[PDB]
Design a protein around this ligand. Structure first.
Ligand code: AGS
Ligand code: AGS
Ligand code: AGS
Ligand code: MG
Ligand code: MG
Ligand code: MG
Lengths: 426, 319, 327, 274, 290, 284
DNA sequence: GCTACGGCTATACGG
DNA sequence: GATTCGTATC
């Protein structure tokens, strides 16, 4: 009389739908974080939705927290719905983190933060970033272990005017946690992957064998295998798979089986645009589905830069120069359309059509990379700082003004070979 | 001095039996009503195909007498933020309402595609703790708008466009219950202009009967207009340039359609076109994009549309 | 004080019988109001077609002496965000009638320039309060509206004003102002307006101003062309003939003479040549493509500014090159 | 840096009142008020269009004012959290309202503020974190110079005088309004005309009482005008000076004398020109 | 000047104008000027209207030298006027309200011997609609009740404190000299009612008619479903009031007369919500049976 | 099921203050009704701060309780339910300009009540002007768990007068200092509301170090049984202290043994019993 | 004298 | 989506 993702829930660590390597590394990290030494303070779990990112922490705490606790068992999940009377919503998480640090000896309990505060609001987002930053840099000799399961999901289109970006596009850990936290030596980011087909089939078969009377009663036990295979091959979400299986089993008719559609990742979308999709051989259908399901990813200028930086992976880069010229020319034309959706459609349709007429069997492809634009902009900012310093020291010594363009082109190069080459002589 | 409900509201379905179209989905909803074990659902489809009416009918047939305090119909018109999800939805879900066996409260979050991200994140938490007593019933035109973590624990029932037979059946029921003189060609024209939208067909029939009386093709077409996505497809697929130019100048320009609308409809039709080569399709998309840029800059004129048609015909027929 | 008004504001129709042209829409809404029930309307069409003068006249004819407390009008000149839609419209359309007069009309002029969030929040207000409130939507661009909002709105298309309606309105304006207009000048007004009453009214006001004696003098075609700086058909035909037949030097000289003796702009001449070239034989299909593409490019360049002489030479060369595909 | 100052209220109700007024003003203006502790006196700096506040607190104010440092003329500069200083001064004046001096020291930086209260030895320790600035930044922070080319020092009526309450009301006339952002002060050979011009809301507040001290005009922000009005309430001697389209000077002075006089000056930069 | 009125007491007019504060905080107001005095009419969303009257006897130098019009109307803002009349005092500040006809600012000259403040406000064209639209019909009054100002103010403050998203009005009279008048609140806490006392000190008079304003009936309850966002617009108005009179007709229009020179009379009118739910009235009636 | 009336000014004030503080501890206040006393308690989201208020039968003028209702929990028989704190705190507040003549709270889950009263608490407020206000806040029946700490903690014992403590707490602010360092010595007793500082990457200053302190005496201590440098939170401590003086009928007792065992608090009234438990730090 | 209240203010949120 | 490496298992 309830949903099948409950009741038929994992009871031990073996029942958890997770790969062996993932389980072993998560357990190693947890055991390292429960030692008296505090090499790692927080464990930043991340991954797609419903990838056993929550059901494994409780099972680990069932056989880890009591062992290392003192004598004189579960988690301390943060409730984001508790509206305290004399407490602002920003201060709710502050109080949570300031009261959860007292669980060290005789009160040890893992701190699980899955439902993050409204990080879409800038003020509380930076307050949370500061609070977790204080946790890493805390002078406290002993702190309890802490886990932040940031479920990555593609934030859909919104009516927010600007509100910067990042958290308005994706709900990844990089859009919530800042670079200082990610690169902190005491942070361990163990990412999670979608559940493999084998474990999904195993668990679905376990559910089916645990309830077969109604399956055979509704002449579905003989058709169970195809349904299980289709469900385990269409989605990598365990909870969604169980819900779909329950919906199909409880039903009585010929309703087609449907499941949630996964969002195509950035590298995945780049590969689909460059190489294609094995499922669909029609370019128009694939492009239309890609734009309809994920338009927040194909609209960013990074994806065009991604194609520009990754189209040299087809046949390791041995394709004709004319194809590359056409691709880059059309990319420039799309850049010259001020971000219209038509330009976004054309810049991918042309690439897919070009990489279709030259598709040759038995040609190894290379690897892709993120566009090298952040490095370039950081170097440009460094050069800006250098030019500003040079012009500042220039005006302080002598009354001569020099334009930044000339500094970049002429002054910048000759300034060392003049000043430092005469410092030698002094 | 009107006091007369529109035909859209007048013959609104109150049972899960007169809802035409999507026979399998309606049968599944009937099974849910019979049993009561309603799972979380996210109904998705084109506008005006019974998405909201089906949810309301299933809520009426599940809660029954407890419909007054068993359903919380929230919508885009009402305030839907993180605060409202954390207080009103939380209290409604947390409410201990006695219900018949196998019955759960139905939080009707209609137009859930327009909800804020933080509200959906709080919905995740409230649904994780309150799903043994309450069952959320989302209703949106696009399932992708609802975040995947929410879709993880919600069953998906995507609605399809109503066929020309179910719409005809419901229209005939309305005609019989209203005693309206009809013509076969008139009903065919109503179905054609409906484009699978039952509410639009009902509105067109009501307008035709109230303004002209007898419902035939002439009276339907003298008040309702042929869909412009079809004239756009006709002009884009015209082999000869003169034919397309005439189809534009007489059926989209003098008819009173803005150039920007003509460009957007052309882009959509090209996206959803068929029997055209991929290179031709992308070249047409590029031409439509150039024309769209020219329209947006402020050069919106018939000349730009004619140039777009000329470019399309040139890339279709070569040199 | 109505005399101290622009002719586009003091000639605004006050009753449905003064809204010429849109006869089908007027008849349909009259049938609706006479039969009591009025569906949620949506008026669409080019600007200046009477999409507001019709709805305001309908509101006046429905709510006599009560056009103020029964009708709420919101336009782009005021904020129409989420808060406005969720508070003001809801409060107005959620209250009982003043004197049980009927339903509460809500006129949303220029609803195209509205955020999609507001357009989606308005739909449930429209559907949940349809018993005592009927919404009217005025928009010039249909692509700006949510498809669901279009679904829950009966669509009336305000087509460009036909020649007969504009002629009748011009006759009424002439009678009211005691003016005289030549039939050729009236046809020039028809072609200049291209389905827009406000353009005709403004040009007539400017012509009356341009006349030394607005009483004993007749507004001729020359006045109608001089007051707006528009090219006469004769000069456009001469320019087209010079470009199509004479050599490059004489064509350029004729173009310069036409654009200098009267001050005519180049874009107006381009539009006139385009219009005169539509009803041409042009057997070869490539000539049409060349003409349309090159003239559109030149018009786009003119819209961004530049050298008028170079643009005119480009026009001449483009037309000559396009008509070389003829032979 | 053995900075150890001692403040008391009962033995002198004027110097402590001046110190409290300065602390309240610097707290109201902005955060992180600079404290330039010299050997001769003390200056509570408040430097960000935005106005600047400068005061001269004589060493006679503090019973054991000792500032010893290796820098020039024993100059110690230390930016401090004025909010915490405001809180501790509020606590101390609450203690006085309810005979222990407010002894302060520089513990390590940190201000070892402490004072006892009797309801009963209730020692209220109020350590406040404080930074220490260098000479280069201290030399960078300097009091602005006002050229007296035509600066007219309109002598404001004393508070104790009969006209004092009327002039205070005249100053606060524009405060009660809500849509007031910029105030166009005008001074003529003398009377004060508080004139505020908007799109439709006109204002011609004028003072008719006798005043002591061509025309002078300046436009200043109403945010600083409330601060000036609050300052005018405490100090008996008050001088308001107007620079023609250049600046505005609200010169307050507390003549302790013999004994060094204390003054506080707030320079207002015309938010917009004439 | 066509109009010129001088007053010595500013706190009274200040409170009278501040009674309009709960309405649009920064918007336009209409000021009718006639021989009787000057008035302030404010309407929000065409659902609620408030009218404040200041009689001639309140002032001391009322002239009204205009002759071409029986009444003179002008549209100005509210915040600036309230701030000007909030001048308080130290010596009486004699206001010099003036208006020199069409195209002239509504000048407020304040003289305090030492201070000669003069304030001018430009006039906006018109509200441009029939203001007299919320007036109740004096033939179909459903009920007429009089309640003291303090009790109603306390009840409205209590409703505001507990949220009170929507409000109901319950009025019923019995032949056994037992009259019941109370307000129901649909808030986050559910349906909460506030029963006013039947004593004549609180409720001086209660007469439930039958849509004719003449026949008094017993056992019939008049339900008025009013949105509280408009019902709280007169919360502070009753705070300075002595007696408050309630009038609601069958047209769903509430009329509240507030009275504290013959004092100040505040005549407000409110529209009634459509009451979509049929069971809402039924459940209110069932709740009122206890 | 039960009925309890509060016909007094001070009793109503202390009831409102206790409800407000329990709301400032957790979003929903949990109330357990018994045949001898009314117990309202709240617990933090981290299971670290727990406060229980026990209004005895003598607190209510008419405290009836009939557990013969058809949830119910048996150990004596007591009925427990959970109600929203933010909804109960806006009911018990004293209106300004008027006075609460009678404040009674009751519920009847029997078959007599209709669906409108089903799972709806009844609280009735009567003004001095005879104005009667009715509210129906919703509730959900739950089960009560008595945390056995007071029976086990009764380790050093400290009894101090709450006047100076309350003054120091109201002088403190919950946004600048979030710690309480209660240090008691044989010579003097000191309470410091300090704040640990957090250093950034390049030895920056991420968190300030406000160190408000207060030392009074040892003789003034009513009972200083040393038989200590304990540290705990501040925000809940101030509210629990301010609970008491709201009734004009004031001291408080301290219980703590080890840095791991939570510190126990208890201050009593003629009809109100107050208890607070806070988990401290074990950083020796 | 203390109160209960009017005005001030620090401020979490708003758009 | 493609590559390289890596166990685990039938
Ligand atoms: N064999 C199984 N393996 C994993 N989860 C299972 C299994 N059987 C049932 N479940 C349920 O499926 C759900 C999966 O939970 P998790 O994926 O761990 O949570 P999650 O990853 O945080 O999901 P999100 O990110 O909140 S959408 C839980 O409710 C489990 O109780
Ligand atoms: N299958 C159907 N059978 C009968 N009437 C229908 C059907 N689908 C829609 N309608 C009519 O459509 C009108 C309202 O339909 P809705 O369910 O509100 O539209 P919708 O499917 O929810 O699309 P949106 O997104 O809400 S615009 C009523 O007049 C219904 O009678
Ligand atoms: N049918 C008509 N007959 C006579 N005058 C008309 C007619 N339609 C429009 N006009 C005139 O044109 C003016 C502008 O028309 P409106 O109805 O106010 O605006 P509109 O036609 O809706 O165009 P937009 O989209 O609002 S800019 C009116 O005030 C009339 O003077
Ligand atoms: Mg989880
Ligand atoms: Mg719907
Ligand atoms: Mg218009």
């Amino acid at each position: 009389g309830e949903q099948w993702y409950e009741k038929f829930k994992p009871n031990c660590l073996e029942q958890v739908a997770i790969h062996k390597r993932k389980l072993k590394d998560v357990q190693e990290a947890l055991d390292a974080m429960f030692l008296p030494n505090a090499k790692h303070r927080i464990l930043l779990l991340s991954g797609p939705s419903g990838c056993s990112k929550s059901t494994v922490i409780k099972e680990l705490s069932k056989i880890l927290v009591p062992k290392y606790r003192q004598n004189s068992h579960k988690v301390t999940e943060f409730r984001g719905d508790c509206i305290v009377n004399d407490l602002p919503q920003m201060e709710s998480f502050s109080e949570f983190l300031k009261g959860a640090r007292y669980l060290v000896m005789s009160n040890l309990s893992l701190i699980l933060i899955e439902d993050l505060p409204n990080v879409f609001h800038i003020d509380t987002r930076r307050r949370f970033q500061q609070l977790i930053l204080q946790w890493l840099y805390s002078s406290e000799p002993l702190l309890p272990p802490l886990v932040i399961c940031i479920t990555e999901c593609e934030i859909p289109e919104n009516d927010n005017n600007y509100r910067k970006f990042g958290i308005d596009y994706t709900f990844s850990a990089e859009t919530i946690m800042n670079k200082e936290i990610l690169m902190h030596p005491r942070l361990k980011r163990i990412k999670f992957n979608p559940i493999n087909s084998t474990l999904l089939k195993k668990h679905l078969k376990f559910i089916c064998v645990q309830n077969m009377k109604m399956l055979k009663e509704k002449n579905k036990w003989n058709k169970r295998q195809e349904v299980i295979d289709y469900i385990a091959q269409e989605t990598g979400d365990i909870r969604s798979a169980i819900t779909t299986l329950q919906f199909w089993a409880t039903s009585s008719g010929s309703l087609p089986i449907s499941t949630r559609e996964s969002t195509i990742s950035y590298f995945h979308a780049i590969g689909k645009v460059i190489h294609g999709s094995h499922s669909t051989n029609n370019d128009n259908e694939m492009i239309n589905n890609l734009f309809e399901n994920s338009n927040n990813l194909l609209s960013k200028e990074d994806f065009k830069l991604g194609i520009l930086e990754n189209y040299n992976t087809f046949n390791k880069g041995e394709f004709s120069i004319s194809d590359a010229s056409s691709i880059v020319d059309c990319l420039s034309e799309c850049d010259n359309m001020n971000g219209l959706p038509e330009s976004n459609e054309y810049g991918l349709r042309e690439v897919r059509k070009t990489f279709r007429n030259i598709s040759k069997q038995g040609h190894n492809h290379g690897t892709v990379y993120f566009p090298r634009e952040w490095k370039v902009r950081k170097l440009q900012n460094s050069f800006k700082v250098q030019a500003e310093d040079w012009l500042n020291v220039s005006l302080y010594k002598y009354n001569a003004v020099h334009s930044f363009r000339n500094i970049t082109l002429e002054f910048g190069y000759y300034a060392p070979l003049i000043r430092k080459c005469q410092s030698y002589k002094k | 001095l009107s006091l007369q409900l529109p035909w859209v509201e007048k013959y609104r379905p109150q049972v899960l039996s007169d809802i035409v179209g999507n026979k399998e989905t309606i049968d599944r909803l009937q099974q849910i009503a019979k049993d009561g074990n309603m799972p979380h659902m996210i109904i998705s489809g084109m506008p005006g195909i019974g998405k909201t009416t089906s949810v309301h009918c299933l809520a009426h047939e599940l809660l029954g007498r407890s419909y007054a305090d068993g359903v919380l119909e929230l919508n885009a018109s009402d305030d839907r933020g993180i605060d409202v999800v954390r207080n009103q939805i939380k209290h409604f879900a947390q409410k201990k309402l006695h219900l018949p066996p196998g019955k759960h409260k139905i939080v009707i979050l209609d137009e859930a595609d327009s909800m804020t991200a933080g509200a959906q994140q709080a919905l995740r938490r409230t649904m994780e703790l309150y799903s043994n007593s309450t069952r959320f019933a989302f209703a949106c035109n696009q399932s992708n708008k609802i975040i995947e973590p929410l879709q993880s624990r919600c069953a998906i029932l995507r609605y399809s466009k109503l066929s020309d037979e179910d719409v005809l059946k419901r229209l005939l029921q309305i005609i019989k219950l209203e005693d309206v003189k009809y013509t076969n060609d008139g009903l065919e024209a109503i179905i054609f202009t409906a484009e699978g939208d039952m509410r639009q067909a009902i509105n067109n029939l009501q307008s035709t009967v109230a303004g002209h009386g007898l419902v035939n093709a002439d009276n339907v077409f003298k008040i309702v207009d042929s869909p412009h996505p079809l004239i756009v497809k006709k002009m884009l697929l015209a082999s000869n340039l003169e034919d397309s130019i005439q189809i534009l100048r007489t059926d989209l320009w003098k008819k009173g359609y803005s150039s920007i609308d003509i460009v957007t409809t052309s882009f959509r039709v090209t996206k959803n076109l068929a029997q055209v080569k991929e290179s031709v399709r992308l070249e047409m998309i590029k031409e439509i994009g150039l024309t769209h840029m020219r329209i947006l800059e402020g050069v919106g004129t018939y000349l730009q549309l004619a140039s777009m048609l000329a470019k399309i015909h040139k890339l279709n027929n070569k040199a | 004080s109505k005399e101290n008004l622009p002719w586009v504001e003091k000639y605004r129709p006050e009753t449905l019988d003064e809204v010429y042209g849109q006869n089908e829409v007027i008849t349909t809404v009259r049938k609706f109001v006479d039969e009591g029930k009025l569906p949620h309307l949506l008026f669409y069409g080019p600007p200046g077609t009477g999409k507001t003068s019709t709805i305001v006249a309908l509101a006046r004819e429905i709510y006599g002496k009560n056009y103020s407390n029964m009708v709420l009008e919101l336009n782009a000149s005021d904020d129409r965000g989420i808060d406005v839609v969720r508070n003001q419209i809801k409060d107005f359309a959620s209250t009982r009638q003043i004197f049980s007069k009927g339903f509460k009309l809500i006129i949303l002029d220029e609803a195209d320039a509205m955020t999609n969030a507001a357009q989606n929040a308005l739909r449930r207000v429209i559907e949940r309060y349809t018993k005592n409130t009927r919404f009217c939507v005025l928009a010039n661009y249909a692509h700006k509206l949510t498809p669901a909002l279009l679904s829950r709105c009966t669509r009336f298309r305000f087509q460009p004003l036909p020649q007969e309606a504009i002629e009748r309105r011009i006759a009424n304006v002439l009678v009211h102002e005691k003016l005289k207009l030549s039939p050729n000048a009236e046809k020039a007004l028809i072609e200049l307006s291209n389905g827009d009453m406000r353009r005709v009214l403004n040009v007539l006001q400017s012509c009356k101003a341009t006349l030394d004696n607005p009483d004993e003098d007749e507004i001729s075609d020359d006045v109608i062309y001089e007051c707006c700086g528009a090219p006469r058909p004769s000069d456009l035909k001469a320019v087209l003939k010079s470009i199509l037949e004479d050599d490059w030097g004489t064509a350029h000289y004729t173009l310069n003479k036409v654009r200098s003796a009267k001050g005519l702009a180049l874009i107006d001449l381009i539009e006139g040549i385009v219009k005169i070239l539509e009803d041409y034989e042009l057997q070869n299909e490539e000539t049409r493509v060349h003409l349309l593409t090159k003239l559109a490019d030149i018009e786009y360049s003119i819209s961004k500014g530049g050298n008028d002489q170079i643009q005119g030479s480009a026009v001449i060369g483009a037309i000559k090159a396009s008509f070389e595909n003829e032979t | 840096m053995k900075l150890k100052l001692i403040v008391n209220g009962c033995e002198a109700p004027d110097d402590y009142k001046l110190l409290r007024t300065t602390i309240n003003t610097v707290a109201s203006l902005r955060k992180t008020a600079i404290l330039r502790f010299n050997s001769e006196r003390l200056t509570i700096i408040s430097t960000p269009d935005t106005g600047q506040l400068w005061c001269t607190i004589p060493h006679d104010v503090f019973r054991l004012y000792t500032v010893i440092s290796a820098r020039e003329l024993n100059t110690i500069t230390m930016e401090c959290n004025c909010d915490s200083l405001l809180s501790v001064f509020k606590r101390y004046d609450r203690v006085m309202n309810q005979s222990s001096n407010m002894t302060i020291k520089l513990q390590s930086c940190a201000l070892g503020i402490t004072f006892e209260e009797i309801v009963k030895v209730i020692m209220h320790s109020f350590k406040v974190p404080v930074k220490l600035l260098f000479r280069a930044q201290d030399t960078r922070i300097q009091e602005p110079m006002i050229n007296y080319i035509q600066l007219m020092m309109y002598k404001l009526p004393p508070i104790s005088g009969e006209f004092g309450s009327a002039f205070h009301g005249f100053i606060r006339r524009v405060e009660r309004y809500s849509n007031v952002n910029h105030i166009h002060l005008m001074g003529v050979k003398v009377e004060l005309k508080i004139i505020v011009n908007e799109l439709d809301w006109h204002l011609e507040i004028c003072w008719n009482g006798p005043l002591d001290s061509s025309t002078h005009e300046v436009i200043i922000r109403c945010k600083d005008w409330k601060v000036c009005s609050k300052l005018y309430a405490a100090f008996e001697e008050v001088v308001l000076a107007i620079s023609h389209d250049e600046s505005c000077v609200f010169h307050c002075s507390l003549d302790r004398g013999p004994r060094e006089r204390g003054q506080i000056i707030y320079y207002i930069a015309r938010s917009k020109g004439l | 000047n066509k109009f010129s009125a001088s007053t010595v007491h500013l706190e009274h007019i200040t409170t009278a104008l501040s009674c309009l504060t709960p309405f649009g905080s920064k918007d336009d107001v209409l000021i009718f000027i006639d021989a009787d005095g000057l008035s302030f009419v404010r309407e929000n969303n065409h659902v609620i209207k408030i009218q404040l009257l200041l009689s001639r006897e309140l002032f001391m130098s009322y002239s009204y030298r205009n002759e071409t019009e029986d009444h003179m109307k002008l549209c100005v803002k509210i915040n600036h006027i309230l701030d000007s009349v909030s001048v308080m005092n130290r010596d009486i500040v004699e206001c010099t309200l003036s208006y020199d006809g069409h195209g002239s600012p509504f000048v407020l000259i304040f003289e305090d011997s030492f201070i000669s403040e003069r304030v001018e406000y430009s006039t906006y064209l018109i509200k441009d609609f029939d203001t007299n639209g919320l007036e109740l019909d004096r033939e179909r009054i459903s009920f007429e009740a009089i309640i003291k100002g303090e009790a109603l103010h306390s009840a409205l403050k209590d409703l505001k404190e507990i949220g009170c998203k929507e409000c109901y009005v319950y009025a019923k009279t019995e032949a056994n000299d037992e009259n019941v008048f109370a307000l129901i609140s649909k808030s986050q806490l559910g349906f909460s009612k506030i029963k006013l006392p039947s004593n004549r000190s609180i409720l001086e008079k209660l007469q439930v008619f039958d849509g004719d304003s003449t026949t008094v009936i017993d056992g019939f309850a008049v339900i008025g479903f009013f949105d509280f966002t408009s019902f709280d617009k007169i919360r502070k108005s009753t705070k300075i009031a002595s007696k408050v009179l309630f009038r609601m007709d069958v047209h769903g229009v509430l009329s509240v007369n507030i009275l504290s020179y013959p004092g100040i009379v505040i005549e407000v009118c409110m529209l009634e919500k459509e009451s979509i739910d049929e069971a809402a009235q039924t459940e209110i009636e069932l709740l009122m049976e206890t | 099921s039960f009925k309890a009336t509060i016909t007094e000014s001070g009793k109503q004030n202390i009831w409102f203050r206790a409800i407000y503080v329990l709301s400032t501890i957790q979003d929903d206040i949990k109330i357990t009704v018994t045949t001898n006393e009314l117990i309202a308690w709240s617990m933090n989201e981290t299971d670290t701060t727990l406060c229980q208020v026990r209004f005895q039968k003598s607190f209510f003028e008419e405290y009836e309780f009939k557990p013969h209702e058809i949830g119910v929990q048996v150990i004596h028989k007591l009925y427990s339910f959970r109600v929203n704190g933010r909804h109960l705190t806006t009911i018990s507040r004293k209106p300004d300009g008027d006075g609460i003549k009678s404040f009674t709270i009751a519920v009847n889950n029997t078959s007599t009540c209709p669906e409108s009263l089903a799972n709806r608490l009844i609280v009735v407020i009567e003004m001095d002007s005879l104005i009667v206000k009715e509210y129906c806040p919703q509730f959900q029946p739950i089960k009560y768990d008595p945390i056995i700490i007071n029976l086990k903690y009764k380790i050093n014992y400290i009894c101090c007068n709450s006047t100076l403590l309350k003054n120091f707490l109201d002088n403190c602010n919950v946004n600048v200092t979030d710690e309480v360092k209660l240090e008691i010595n044989v010579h003097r007793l000191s309470i410091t509301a300090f704040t640990k500082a957090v250093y950034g990457k390049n030895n920056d200053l991420l968190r300030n170090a406000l160190s408000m302190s207060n030392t009074i005496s040892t003789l003034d201590l009513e009972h200083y049984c040393l038989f200590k440098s304990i540290i705990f939170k501040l925000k809940d401590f101030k509210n629990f202290i301010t609970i008491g003086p709201s009734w004009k009928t004031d001291n408080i007792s301290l219980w703590f043994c080890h840095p791991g065992d939570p510190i126990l608090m208890q201050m009593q009234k003629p009809g109100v019993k107050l208890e607070l438990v806070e988990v401290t730090d074990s950083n020796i």
